[PDB]
Design a protein around this nucleic acid. Structure first.
Ligand SMILES: [Mg+2]
Lengths: 145, 157, 109, 242, 121
RNA sequence: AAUCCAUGACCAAAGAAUCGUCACAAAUCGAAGCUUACAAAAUGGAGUAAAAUUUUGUUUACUCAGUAAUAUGCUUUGGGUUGAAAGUCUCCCACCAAUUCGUAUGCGGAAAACGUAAUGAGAUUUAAAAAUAAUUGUUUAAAUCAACUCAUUAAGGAGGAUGCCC
RNA sequence: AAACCAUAGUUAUGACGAUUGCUCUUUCCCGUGCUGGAUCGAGUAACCCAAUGGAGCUUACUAUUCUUGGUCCAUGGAUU
């Protein structure tokens, strides 16, 4: 009767996996060392192919066929590592579990995929992204002192 | 009543006792915001509590404005300070003194500053803590317009 | 009667009086009972009162938008008002079987 | 608020001395947990039931959170708690709980045999029951024992970290967690992350979706995880104090 | 002696009322934070510069608390001003079982200290 | 012909309610609200305790508003909402002692290509529906009933006649 | 350059758990019967969804794919 869509916001976080280098313990230092940057070999068709492979490997044949009907990456840029994937409201939990089960990129290792906000509209997703970006600047300004 | 923090540094203070906090404010927070060494100012400090008499405080204040020498070329500044619920009585005493002094066709020049103490208390659950903030108002009143004190962080009134 | 906790009133509501044996439970609920998580706790068993506790009826019950709670306009008996040593009072709907707690204030009209 | 109760300590025995690299990796993974968003952290330390317990009270816990993590505690703003699991196989080399219950805060068990489950359900002052999710379960999870140990207050702990280690043990972990969900009837289910590397920790949404697709309803996951973790922390702190 | 207190004269033109929060003695802290954030966002589309925060009497303490919160939390310039507020009080003068509400009235002025707190963007 | 039982056809009404739960000094699939600033402690508040001071006055240490507020919490509700949100249907959402439908016209109604009441008639041979403005899969009737269309009946008071309880 | 305004408001109204009530069928009981009580079960539908507000009309709905009231010079059986 009405096509119900639901977008998922996900972020790529790189943990400082280095035991030979000691790290500073605070809020903004770990926020900066976790939000450093995404590598150059990052694209939309390269992340969609990887998540499709992971979904087909973890769920199966029908589990990937039911979710791959409306599985698209609407907006994503490698500068901040925030992407918005479109999916249905029935298979949203399956897409979240697939994002959780994302092991690694074909060339880049040691990364975590974190789903932050999920909703059925893009306007509220953009509003929450702007709110999160504004909140990020506060700890930065406070720690620069 | 777990701890007192100022300038992200833990201090040994008590909110219920006024003497210790007033002496701490007189000795630490004021010299770090105003320097009386490289200027020509004569600063008279005064802390206001809620148990002090308003008329007696005004009788202290109208005298503290004409105690220093006039031959030395001194700008005489009075630093009134308080914290917590005593700020209401502090403001009342300041406004009554202003009303009593401006009547003689004079002007009172004032600079205000607002900072905060950070205290911690036990929250609703045993695994949660609450962070309370206690305001601190510092006013500098003087009869002269120009003061060589570093008062850029204040507000002109 | 103003609702001091979770609940929504309606017109033609019943006004019951708090009993004497279950007097500390409502006082603790009005003071506060939280979960180990931190949020409030309303998921408990309700001490259903007796029947002979009707003291009033709410005529104009609508969610008060000026304070953020449920305002109840009722009319209680003076004898039962002097009977209780507290200002706590229970509100119930006509179809709902739940009892909300609140406090009433006298209006000089 | 979220609670993690299964952070493992890189040390198995008592003769095993800690390494600075292990402490650095633990600091890294705790920082990553706090980065993904958490409030309560309870590091776990594993020990064998066959090993000799020390004749000490001032040395039962080779952690000492106050001297090691006490700076991180007031800097980043989280808390740490003591938890110890018991790898129990057979009724031998034991009969001591009153001295291990006062030092640590949470006491868990790891039964791997037939009599281990019976002795865990009989007279063990434990809070959580943990199974080897990586390898096969001992015999079969039945209702006769699980119902009886849940009705008293002991919950079942599920490790979603063991799945992210390799590819082959994923099948065994799934076949074991679904058996535990079918036997426990979805009442006393607490979850923890048994990861030692900062690359195997996830957020609340992914874990919730995983446990929902694995057989647990969305109400059970949230309510159980949150309130039961808070309640086990509370009763542990209470039995530690008094 | 019976005496009632009416509010103080408020003369707001069209927009001084909009970008101004009057903190009551029963006003919660978080609701004040929320309304202050809404005012701060809506000011530059209302066409003002600052957000006025006015409180007198018992609410002065938590008004200063709200001020010092946004002072360092969001790093926004704050300005505190000490003002006087005149309030009219209606009292009964002495000069039949009659209700005390319906009696002779006399107006009296009372001055109170108050704090105005402006917050920049 | 009366009553009862079962089926079928047609007309009319309505669209069960209540409770609890979902991380981030902010969040949620969302939304609103907790702002006519005061505890008559500002007619330069009310008192207690110590020193000194020939009392005033002054310097320290405290009490009183207690039904007290309790820090991103807290309360509410969210697809037929006036039973159809659906539909290329109609109309109101500025006035006009009047080139402005100055329309006392069956009743109600601001209007309505709007509801209903009494009587008579009608069927491409008809005022008009079919086999040379909107809507509907069937799309009024054509033994009797039921349904559609059109043609008449201006409001109030008084007198006489008839029918019913009386 | 705004007039920004909904006891839903811009196509959002999500995830399950528990309780009461209704239809028929399965059985028991007091006193034939009772808006009777208690289990053993199923069902709680279909038409369809707002985008500024209100009224009128028409058109879709309710077959083990929830219900209710009445009527019938409709037929079927029985008594007078
Ligand atoms: Mg529409």
């Amino acid at each position: 009767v009405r096509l119900k869509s639901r977008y998922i916001l996900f972020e790529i976080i790189f943990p400082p996996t280095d035991t030979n280098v000691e790290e500073s313990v605070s809020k903004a230092d770990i926020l900066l060392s976790h939000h450093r940057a995404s590598p150059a070999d990052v694209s939309i068709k390269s992340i969609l192919q990887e998540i499709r492979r992971s979904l087909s490997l973890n769920l199966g044949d029908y589990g990937s066929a039911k979710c791959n009907s409306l599985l698209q990456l609407k907006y994503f840029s490698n500068k901040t590592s925030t992407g918005i994937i479109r999916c249905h409201r029935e298979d949203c939990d399956l897409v979240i579990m697939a994002l959780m089960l994302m092991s690694k990129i074909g060339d880049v290792d040691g990364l975590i995929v974190n789903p932050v906000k999920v909703s059925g509209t893009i306007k509220k997703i953009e509003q929450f992204a702007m709110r999160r970006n504004s909140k990020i600047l506060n700890i930065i300004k406070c720690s620069q002192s | 009543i777990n701890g007192v923090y100022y300038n992200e540094i833990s201090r040994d203070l008590d909110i219920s006792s006024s003497t210790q906090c007033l002496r701490f404010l007189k000795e630490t927070v004021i010299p770090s915001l105003a320097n009386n060494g490289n200027n020509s100012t004569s600063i008279q400090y005064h802390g206001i509590s809620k148990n002090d008499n308003i008329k007696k405080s005004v009788n202290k204040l109208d005298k503290q404005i004409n105690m220093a020498d006039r031959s030395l070329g001194l700008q005489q500044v009075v630093c009134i300070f308080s914290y917590g619920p005593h700020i209401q009585k502090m403001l009342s005493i300041l406004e009554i003194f202003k009303k009593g002094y401006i009547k003689n066709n004079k002007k009172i020049y004032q600079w205000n500053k607002l900072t905060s103490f950070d205290i911690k208390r036990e929250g609703r659950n045993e695994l949660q803590e609450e962070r309370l903030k206690v305001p601190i108002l510092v006013t500098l009143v003087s009869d002269s317009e120009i003061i060589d004190l570093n008062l850029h962080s204040f507000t002109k009134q | 009667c103003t609702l001091l906790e979770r609940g929504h009133p309606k017109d033609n509501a019943r006004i019951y009086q708090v009993p004497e044996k279950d007097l500390e439970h409502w006082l603790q609920l009005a003071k506060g009972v939280y979960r180990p998580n931190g949020r409030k706790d309303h998921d408990l068993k309700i001490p259903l009162p007796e029947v002979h506790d009707l003291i009033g009826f709410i005529t104009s019950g609508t969610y008060h938008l000026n304070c953020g709670n449920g305002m109840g306009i009722g009319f209680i008996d003076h004898h039962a008002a002097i009977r209780q040593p507290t200002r706590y009072v229970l509100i119930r709907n006509v179809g709902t079987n739940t009892y909300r707690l609140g406090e009433w204030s006298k209006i000089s009209v | 608020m979220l609670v993690d109760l299964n952070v493992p300590w890189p040390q198995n025995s008592y003769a095993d001395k800690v390494t600075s690299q292990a402490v650095n990796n633990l600091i890294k993974t705790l920082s990553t947990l706090h980065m993904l968003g958490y409030t309560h952290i309870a590091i776990n330390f594993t020990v064998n039931h066959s090993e000799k317990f020390p004749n000490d009270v001032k040395l039962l816990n080779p952690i000492d959170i106050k001297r090691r993590f006490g700076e991180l505690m007031d800097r980043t703003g989280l808390k740490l708690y003591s938890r110890i699991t018991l790898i129990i196989d057979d009724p031998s080399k034991g009969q001591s709980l009153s001295k291990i219950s006062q030092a640590f805060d949470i006491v868990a068990a790891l039964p791997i045999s037939e009599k281990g489950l019976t002795l865990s359900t009989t007279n063990l002052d434990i809070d959580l029951l943990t199974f080897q999710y990586g390898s096969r379960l001992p015999t079969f999870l039945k209702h006769k024992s699980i119902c009886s140990c849940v009705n008293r207050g002991v919950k079942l702990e599920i490790v979603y970290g063991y799945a992210l280690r390799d590819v082959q043990a994923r099948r065994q972990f799934v076949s074991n967690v679904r058996s535990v969900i079918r036997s426990s009837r979805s009442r006393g289910i607490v979850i923890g992350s048994g990861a030692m590397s900062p690359l195997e920790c996830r957020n609340i949404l992914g874990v919730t979706s995983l446990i929902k697709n694995l057989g647990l309803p969305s109400d059970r996951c949230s309510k159980a995880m949150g309130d039961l973790a808070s309640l086990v922390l509370l009763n542990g702190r209470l039995r530690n104090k008094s | 002696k019976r005496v009632t207190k009416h509010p103080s004269l408020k003369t707001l033109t069209h927009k001084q009322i909009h970008t101004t929060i009057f903190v009551k003695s029963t006003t919660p802290y978080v609701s004040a934070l929320k309304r202050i954030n809404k005012f701060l966002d809506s000011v530059h589309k209302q066409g003002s510069s600052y957000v006025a925060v006015l409180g007198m009497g018992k609410a002065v303490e938590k008004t200063l608390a709200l001020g010092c919160h946004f002072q360092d939390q969001k790093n926004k310039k704050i300005e505190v001003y000490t003002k006087t507020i005149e309030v009219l009080d209606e009292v009964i003068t002495e000069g039949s079982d009659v209700e005390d509400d319906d009696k002779e009235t006399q107006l009296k002025k009372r001055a109170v200290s108050g704090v105005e707190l402006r917050i920049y963007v």
